[PDB]
Design an enzyme around this catalytic site. Structure first.
Site, PDB file in Angstrom:
ATOM      1  N   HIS A  45     -14.084 -51.507 -28.964  1.00  0.00           N
ATOM      2  CA  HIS A  45     -13.183 -50.470 -28.485  1.00  0.00           C
ATOM      3  C   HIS A  45     -12.417 -50.972 -27.273  1.00  0.00           C
ATOM      4  CE1 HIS A  45     -15.566 -49.686 -24.912  1.00  0.00           C
ATOM      5  NE2 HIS A  45     -16.645 -49.463 -25.642  1.00  0.00           N
ATOM      6  N   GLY A  46     -11.277 -50.348 -27.010  1.00  0.00           N
ATOM      7  CA  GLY A  46     -10.458 -50.745 -25.882  1.00  0.00           C
ATOM      8  C   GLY A  46     -11.113 -50.538 -24.528  1.00  0.00           C
TER       9      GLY A  46
ATOM     10  N   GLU B   2     -23.147 -48.092 -28.752  1.00  0.00           N
ATOM     11  CA  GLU B   2     -23.555 -49.160 -27.854  1.00  0.00           C
ATOM     12  C   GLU B   2     -25.020 -48.840 -27.534  1.00  0.00           C
ATOM     13  OE1 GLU B   2     -22.060 -52.080 -25.672  1.00  0.00           O
ATOM     14  OE2 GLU B   2     -24.130 -52.011 -26.404  1.00  0.00           O
TER      15      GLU B   2
ATOM     16  N   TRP C 172     -15.072 -48.443 -16.774  1.00  0.00           N
ATOM     17  CA  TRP C 172     -16.300 -49.190 -16.497  1.00  0.00           C
ATOM     18  C   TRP C 172     -16.283 -50.620 -17.028  1.00  0.00           C
ATOM     19  CZ3 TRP C 172     -21.021 -45.322 -17.236  1.00  0.00           C
ATOM     20  CH2 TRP C 172     -20.911 -44.319 -16.252  1.00  0.00           C
TER      21      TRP C 172
ATOM     22  N   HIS D 217     -28.190 -47.624 -25.512  1.00  0.00           N
ATOM     23  CA  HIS D 217     -28.307 -46.576 -24.509  1.00  0.00           C
ATOM     24  C   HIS D 217     -28.942 -47.218 -23.279  1.00  0.00           C
ATOM     25  CE1 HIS D 217     -28.751 -42.982 -22.386  1.00  0.00           C
ATOM     26  NE2 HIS D 217     -29.950 -42.611 -22.795  1.00  0.00           N
TER      27      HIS D 217
HETATM   28 CL    CL Z   1     -17.998 -52.345 -24.689  1.00  0.00          CL
END
Ligand code: CL
Length: 170
Positions: free
Chosen positions: A8-9, A74, A13, A76
């Site tokens: 993902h873009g 992703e 963070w 946790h």
């Molecule tokens: Cl990421």
């Protein structure tokens, strides 16, 4: 099996060096632009996506209508969500850099994480585009003997479970 894994873009963070896992952060403006640049650049195969906003948004902007699946999330990070990499306890940093023996407090163990990921890949019958996260792409590449470092908003094609086919960084 040909599998396109799309990271993902950019989110704030990914930019500020803060662990990002299940926290539902949105893409930045540049992150959205990275997603848009993927439209028409990836094979129009059936799409699957993590259910976290940033992944779903990337899919949408890239011209896809993915089926949402949590197994593509992703890892946790539990208590370490948002944790600044700079001050991260050396033990976690080391474990995260080695990609092994890492179990963030309140989060998933790296072993449980990689199990749900590879289990999902095994369930795919036909080539597809997976809109997921950095740790997912890394687990797959590492298993294949190759580095799992691709930039946000990029994609890598792999002939699972054998090797890497092509890396797309536009
Ligand atoms: Cl990421």
């Amino acid at each position: 099996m040909e599998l396109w894994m799309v990271r993902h873009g950019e989110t704030l963070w990914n930019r500020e060096g803060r662990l990002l896992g299940w926290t539902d952060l949105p893409l930045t403006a540049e992150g959205e632009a990275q997603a848009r640049r993927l439209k028409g650049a990836l094979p129009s195969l059936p799409a699957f996506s993590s259910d976290l906003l940033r992944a779903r948004r990337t899919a949408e902007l890239a011209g896809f209508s993915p089926r949402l699946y949590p197994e593509l999330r992703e890892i946790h990070f539990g208590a370490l969500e948002g944790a600044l990499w700079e001050t991260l306890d050396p033990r976690y940093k080391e474990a995260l850099l080695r990609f092994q023996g890492f179990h963030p407090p309140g989060g998933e163990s790296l072993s449980a994480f990689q199990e749900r990921v590879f289990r999902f890949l095994e369930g795919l019958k036909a080539p597809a585009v997976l809109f997921t996260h950095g740790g997912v792409v890394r687990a797959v590449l590492r298993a294949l003997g190759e580095d799992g470092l691709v930039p946000p908003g990029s994609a890598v094609a792999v002939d699972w479970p054998r090797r890497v086919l092509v890396r797309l960084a536009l």
